[PDB]
């Protein structure tokens, strides 16, 4: 397990592009010593790569600090009442128009379309609410089929995922050990 | 030497404050495996701590991407022709006033005063040039005697320096071992 963590460390430092927007998540990842924490922070790191890549391709700002739509508008001096908690992956307030980005990765066409319609409807629910406040919603849904991005070579991305999986099977092993769970739950009843 | 590198990595990750302006240099430091590179990146890391600390204490923005005075003014919509290439450690354009920061660390009073006068004169040379363009220079020279900064506890700063020194000692002894080799003869006889 320590060898896996060490391998994931070197891939992070040597094969993840030195973009400033990835720095914080790289450090969070590198600070983890516990296998399940390395796994979570590793998944979050790979996700940030994709989100940043999607923001760049969509011509908008990556939602670095996970601000909500309400927070985004407030900072630009726009008052918006009773709007759902939507945290976009990207955004850009340009003139009267608010670009909102939602990206995802789905491996099957069935799950891809289902998620595209969910993401489309999620952004669409705030259209009329924003228009009352004089804001024109520009909703972008970026659907992807793979976990590839411009910050990592294809082999490195694959190897990072292969190592995270090896780390997950060591964690799912502990989840299966919960044959002991049935005993202590029965020790209460 | 691998134990020293490991100790320095631990101090970097656990005892250097998680300020995002330090993130890039922390990663550059953490990526180094060669003792001489760990040392250089370690010194640069300690220097960024001081520069950022100096900018915070001086009430201005740390010059993260090493922009020039001309570049700083241009971004705020100010046209300025003849201007020497001056890259401050910090800056702030507020109103019609341009705050420019220069910080340093000197260990002896003689070197401290000499560097204070150099830094003062460096910023002063663009005073009239900036005024001829409507902007009032607010030049700040922040001289320091030690490496104390708000991003590291005193003990951690001390231990980081103590470990970097042990690395300097090892790395210059490997230079001595290398200087006895024949590759160093091909290295010195390299001019060409
Ligand atoms: Cl200096
Ligand atoms: Na200096």
Residue numbers in the entry:
A (entry chain A): 0 to 188
B (entry chain B): 0 to 191
Wording from the paper:
The endonuclease domain is at the N-terminus of the L protein, a multifunctional protein that includes the RNA-dependent RNA polymerase.
In this study, we decided to assess the impact of a key residue within the catalytic site but a priori not involved in the mechanism. For this, we mutated a conserved aspartate to alanine (D118A). From a structural point of view, we confirmed by crystallography that the mutation has no effect on the overall LCMV endonuclease structure, as preliminarily shown by the study of the thermal stability of ENDO-D118A by DSF. (ii) Asp118 makes no direct or indirect interactions with the ions and has virtually no influence on the stability of the protein. This result was confirmed by our structural study (see §3.2). The results summarized in Table 2 show that the affinities of ENDO-WT and ENDO-D118A for DPBA (1) are in the same (micromolar) range. ENDO-WT and ENDO-D118A displayed affinities in the low-micromolar range, while no interaction was detected for ENDO-D88A, confirming the earlier results.
